[PDB]
Amino acid sequence: MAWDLKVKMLGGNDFLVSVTNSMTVSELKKQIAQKIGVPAFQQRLAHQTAVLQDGLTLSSLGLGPSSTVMLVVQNCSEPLSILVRNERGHSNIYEVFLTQTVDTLKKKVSQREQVHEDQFWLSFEGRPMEDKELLGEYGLKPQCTVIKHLRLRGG
């Protein structure tokens, strides 16, 4: 069910986070980020010398209270030029950083094609990208493709 899981980062720290059996590794990284301060996409977890996939569940990994995980946060620094598609088919290139919020990317594509910030939304790999969250939380690869949809403002 629910239990504490110990996380160690190659030192005197062995801090416990309260996780569940029906929790994925990405949600674990988010919970670690909520108390460690480093964005979840920079983190990388390993149990018994085995990299944990962000989509897999802790139950599928055989993790339990009598276990410990080792964390290493990655040192991302470089930016990347990514491709943003339009709903009519147009394509543009934007140079962004994994630490920039999605709001800044919406501002960039707005200033590029002069659309209101509240007049459209965007989505990577079929997932709608939330506004106040970072880009790296969606796994934006270099030269990847991001879709842009014009939301019909109505009510």
Binding site: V17, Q34, W121, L150, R153
Partner: protein, 283 residues
């Protein structure tokens, strides 16, 4: 001495925790924002009838954050706050049942919400977070406040904001089990396999070699479109332009019924500003 009262606090209304109040409405010190039965009471002195009553607080604990993850499948601490802020308004909304379907009397721009609710009541879909499943059951029972507030919370929207039905469905489909769906010779699977911002007509796939889904949806910008009875499950109509307007729902159950808030229109055929069309799919 101090005349106190014991109450229960929870985040999922399943695991209850006993706490103490000292007849003080200053919940911001230790208690935090509290909502009795959905209506905020963070500045309400404890009544004499507030005995053995259940209160909703936000996750201040790791136990409550764990319970919130188990019930809502979320990792946002403000999620409960957003959900309760939406619920404080949706509790006062009205939910008329129209021939078996539950809509909303329009209030606070709930047009897109009512359209999404009417759509979800006519498509086969199983949610992953138990909160959404139980709210959907209660909605199909006639009380839909919790479901609509949850929808607002999952979309980061607030009561009164404008909204697009397609993006709301796209947000909802992330919390749904759609991994079984497949579509192509570009291979697709999941949420991308049930949507298309383009031709409203399913039958218009002349510009899709196979589908493997329990339902499909198509969407276009608001176009005057004629809906043929018996060809589709349900659809949504957008009267107005992109910047402002209003959403109506159309269903093809026996005849072309049209739900607008709490109003019902019967028709054999229909022609109007259609924007989304949903279709049955066995395989």
């Amino acid at each position: 001495e101090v005349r106190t009262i014991k109450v229960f606090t929870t985040v999922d209304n399943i695991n209850l925790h006993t706490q103490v109040v000292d007849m003080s409405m200053t919940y911001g010190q230790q208690f935090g924002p509290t909502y009795l039965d959905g209506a905020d009471v963070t500045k309400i002195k404890p009544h004499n009838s507030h005995e053995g009553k259940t209160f909703y607080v936000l996750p201040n604990d790791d136990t409550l954050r764990v319970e919130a993850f188990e019930y809502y499948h979320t990792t946002d601490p403000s999620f409960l706050g957003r959900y309760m802020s939406a619920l404080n308004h949706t509790k006062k909304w009205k939910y008329p049942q129209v021939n078996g379907l539950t809509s909303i009397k329009w209030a606070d721009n709930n047009s897109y919400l009512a359209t999404a609710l009417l759509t979800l009541q006519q498509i086969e879909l199983k949610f992953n977070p138990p909160a959404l499943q139980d709210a959907y059951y209660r909605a199909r029972a006639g009380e839909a406040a919790n479901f609509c507030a949850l929808i607002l919370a999952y979309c980061n929207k607030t009561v009164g904001e404008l909204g697009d039905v397609r993006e709301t469905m796209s947000y909802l489909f992330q919390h749904a089990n759609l991994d079984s769906c497949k579509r192509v010779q570009t291979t697709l699977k999941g949420v991308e396999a049930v949507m298309y911002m383009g031709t409203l007509s399913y039958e218009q796939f002349k510009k899709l070699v196979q589908q493997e889904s329990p339902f499909v949806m198509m969407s276009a910008p608001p176009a005057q479109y004629e809906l043929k009875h018996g060809t589709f499950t349900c659809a949504s109509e957008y009267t107005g332009n992109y910047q402002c307007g209003h959403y109506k729902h159309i269903t093809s159950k026996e005849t072309l019924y049209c739900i607008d808030g709490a109003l019902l229109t019967k028709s054999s055929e229909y022609k109007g500003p259609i924007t989304d069309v949903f279709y049955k799919e066995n395989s």
